């Protein structure tokens, strides 16, 4: 139940406390982020699972990344990218991998995963995504063109 | 039963049992079994859709977008705040129900009423306002549903004479009203 969610929140804690070190975020903002992260985490660890919960989780993390990106330019602080941004991107990649494993037939989820890998992920991670796509969706010529186009 | 009478007289809507459990949920649009499987986001979406539909027919509803159909109203729960906040909420809900009363037979008004019942529990806190809103349509069946939402079992209650139309599922007769 809450043991896995607790593990994930304690994993999320260090980048939040580093953000509090930055001065990018205030303590009440950290509390609100923790609360909403726990609320979103509780939905995707249930016995009955829906795709929209995964979509909302991914969208919330993307919005948090965008907010951090906007605030870093105003502050002028460019250090500690790896401590926060890479951790968030790794968590989002794990969420995408679980969602794609659960629902293989949904092409739209695969394309959203490809788009996020293009925007935020290393090129080799995007390379692995196309191989997973073409392995089970080799009967669609358009997907072959998109991989060759990239 | 003297202790039982004292306890049942001491009962208040704030300390209701349904606040602390999801076994039963009151809903105007759905049966309680399906109503207990609805997330707050879905009910908020239904309420916003109903209000957006209502805005087309009548503009003057826009003032209800902020206090009742926004994120602040989404997070707000009445039991946590003080009596002054509840009084201001009562004024806002009474005004919105006065505005809703002409359009009650339409579906968007039913969606907005469903969102209000889901979020603010107006069937417990604002019985008089709801009855005033729904009373001119006592010959309809949606009136019977709204009455079935309320709890009027006690014979000393103000609205006890409306008990049979809840128990039998029939509209109120005009002769009884007269």
């Amino acid at each position: 139940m809450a043991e896995i969610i607790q593990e994930r929140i304690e994993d999320r804690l260090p980048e939040l406390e580093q953000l509090e070190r930055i001065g990018l975020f205030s303590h009440a903002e950290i509390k609100a982020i923790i609360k909403k992260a726990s609320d979103l985490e509780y939905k995707i660890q249930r016995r009955t699972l829906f795709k929209e919960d995964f979509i909302n989780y991914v969208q919330y993390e993307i919005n948090l990344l965008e907010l951090i990106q906007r605030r870093r330019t105003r502050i002028g602080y460019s250090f500690k990218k790896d401590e926060i941004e890479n951790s968030i991107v790794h968590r989002v990649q794990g969420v995408f991998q679980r969602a794609s494993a659960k629902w293989k037939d949904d092409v739209q989820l695969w394309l959203s995963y490809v788009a996020f890998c293009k925007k935020w992920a290393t090129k080799t991670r995007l390379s692995k995504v196309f191989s997973a796509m073409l392995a089970i969706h080799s009967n669609k010529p358009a997907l072959w063109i998109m991989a060759a186009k990239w | 039963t003297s202790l039982a009478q004292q306890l049942q007289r001491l009962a208040l809507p704030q300390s209701d049992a349904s606040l602390l459990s999801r076994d039963e949920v009151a809903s105007l649009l759905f049966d309680p079994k399906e109503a207990a499987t609805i997330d707050r986001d879905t009910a908020f979406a239904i309420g916003c859709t109903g209000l957006e539909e209502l805005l087309g027919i009548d503009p003057s509803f826009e003032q209800f977008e902020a206090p009742l159909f926004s994120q602040l109203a989404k997070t707000l729960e009445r039991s946590v705040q003080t009596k002054a906040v509840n009084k201001q909420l009562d004024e806002n809900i009474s005004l919105f129900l006065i505005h809703l009363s002409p359009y009650f037979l339409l579906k968007p008004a039913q969606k907005c009423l469903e969102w209000l019942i889901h979020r603010f529990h107006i069937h417990l806190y604002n019985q008089d306002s709801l009855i005033a809103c729904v009373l001119p349509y006592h010959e309809t069946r949606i009136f019977v549903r709204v009455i079935q939402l309320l709890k009027i079992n006690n014979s000393k209650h103000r609205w006890f004479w409306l008990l049979p139309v809840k128990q039998s599922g029939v509209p109120l007769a005009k002769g009884t009203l007269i």
């Binding site: 692995k128 196309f130 191989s131 | -």
Partner: protein, 88 residues
Amino acid sequence: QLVFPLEKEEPAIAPIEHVLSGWKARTPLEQEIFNLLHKNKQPVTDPLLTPVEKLEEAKMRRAELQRARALQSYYEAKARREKKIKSK
């Protein structure tokens, strides 16, 4: 903690470029394209993207890898130049 077996295991998903090496030619279309490339100088596969199983021909191949790396930096630098112009 000790993990057994001691031998390491490769990651589950190959990143496309490793997979491209394994394929050969059997279609007549592939044969002509295969033949025209080797009679000339152009390689079939990207050397830096596609790893190979770990004298003079190795030395010139290393020079080819250095040139291929040089073009990638040149294209990136030219891409950086146009990005700076659009920012301005």
